[PDB]
């Protein structure tokens, strides 16, 4: 019965494509609001990827954040900036890769997660996060620098709001086979 | 009568400036909606140029797209990404330069056009397109890389909606001397 | 009494950090509207920084602009583009550093200011401005080019509207220790 053997090699080809510099890097930012709704920003790009957004009061204030990267990211390149400290005394970013948890399904890394809560004394947060593809060629930009400039133009961004997390998991996470970690610490994703 | 000879050289100077790395690259994306209205995004920049936008239902759904580049683009560098296929199996872009038509006026290339229709089964499209200036120095980024970084900041974007294509051609295309191809396959533009 | 001597060295450390390539570059664009209100866009980033925005009629039309950079900028790298001249004959930017005034407090440069008025015959302006950190290493991008690509993702942008300039100075400029120059030519800022 050959049907099985071919399916196995075609998954190995997919992992090798995704780990090449033609594989995407994906990031998601989930903002958890006080009315129980969830706002998600997703950006997908080649070479590197980032999000920079302002999360303010809606129709309800944001209370926590979860940032998730695809497994192609180099966790050590992850950087995050946040604010709304005087400018004279500010650092440009922090390297937060050590705070990311591995999301696993069937013992396979499907993503990396950084969850943190926001102080109650706030109703707004401005936030930016950035990560680079883990391929060993990433810091060897001779591929051409202009290819990376084009990737900045071709990055696609998606933004959606859901009424509760259960709706997010059932109609956004599960049908799209995305990695996730919900309020009850249940893992989602599809191992290759 | 000298008035004529000078006018001719000053057009040759303009073409040579536009074909130098100080010439702009321009892109337009036209989205044709079901109520007959047209939405246009224009971006102009040095070295390279791109647009990334989401075209969703209005007050009416988008039905086709036309992408137009200025003649300074290198058609072989054009890349386009599109979506809303699972992420595990996605390619970052397609090279679509071969699908672009030359727009001509008086036998002179005034622009390059890619028109495609959208499936009826959709009411949204997310789309990004990118192109690089054709000057032979484009892939020789030693000009400095920081100059190209500044160009990303200085790119100007314009967005307008028109009630019908005739209004677009009469009050946007014709008075601004832009290249275009309308529903009846008529060409617009001004030869240098 | 040692309390004084330590405070002095810690200011010298701050200036040296800000003048290193880990110091931020900051830009502000103030748009002064006909009803006396003020719109401000602020962007802060590492290596280089820019803003590109469209200032159109509100609820009232914009009448003048003030652009302010932090002292870390190289004034000679400042570039500005502006419009809404035919595209065939356009330049990509002008170098406007010579038009910037030094803002000083206690004989110390706290910022650089370019103020200009808009023609009465307009109700809109599209505008982009860009500047590079003055550290001598800025044009030596071997730090890696990918670090500069990440900085583009991590830049944070802030946008606020105020009813009159007095409210801007009292609740935005003064409490945040920002450099400024008001309608009566009074200087604001905090010397290090």
Curated annotation (Swiss-Prot), chains A, B, C:
Which keywords describe this protein according to UniProt? Glycoprotein, Host cytoplasm, Late protein, Signal, Viral occlusion body
Task: Spell out the InterPro entries in the cross-references.
Answer: Cypo_polyhedrin_Cypovirus1 (IPR008464)
Could you confirm whether the keyword Signal appears in this record? yes
Q: Name one GO cellular component term.
A: viral occlusion body
Q: Which residues are glycosylated?
A: 18, 185
Presence of the UniProt keyword Signal in the record: yes
Q: Where in the cell is it found?
A: Host cytoplasm
Q: Out of the domains of life, which is the source?
A: Viruses
Name where it mostly resides: host cell
Misc: The sequence of strain H is shown.
Q: What does this protein do?
A: Major component of the virus occlusion bodies, which are large proteinaceous structures (polyhedra), that protect the virus from the outside environment for extended periods until they are ingested by insect larvae.
Protein name (Swiss-Prot/TrEMBL) = Polyhedrin
Q: Which organism is it from?
A: Bombyx mori cytoplasmic polyhedrosis virus
């Amino acid at each position: 019965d050959f049907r099985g053997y071919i399916l196995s090699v075609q998954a190995e080809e997919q992992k090798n494509y995704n780990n090449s510099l033609n594989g995407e890097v994906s990031v998601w930012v989930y903002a958890y609001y006080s009315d129980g709704s969830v706002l998600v920003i997703n950006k997908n790009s080649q070479y590197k990827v980032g999000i920079s957004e302002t999360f303010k009061a809606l129709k309800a204030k944001p209370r926590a954040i979860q940032i998730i990267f695809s497994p192609s990211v180099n966790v050590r390149t992850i950087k995050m900036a946040k604010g709304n400290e005087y400018l004279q005394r500010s650092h440009p970013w922090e390297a937060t890769g050590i705070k990311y948890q591995k999301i696993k399904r069937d013992g396979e890394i499907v993503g990396y997660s950084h969850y943190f809560e926001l102080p109650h004394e706030y109703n707004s947060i401005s936030l930016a996060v950035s990560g680079v593809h883990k391929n060993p060629s990433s810091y060897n930009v001779g591929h051409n620098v202009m290819d990376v400039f084009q990737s900045c133009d071709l990055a696609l961004r998606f933004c959606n709001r859901y009424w509760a997390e259960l709706e997010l998991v059932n109609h956004y996470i599960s049908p799209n086979a995305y990695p996730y970690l919900d309020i009850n610490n249940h893992s989602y994703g599809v191992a290759l």
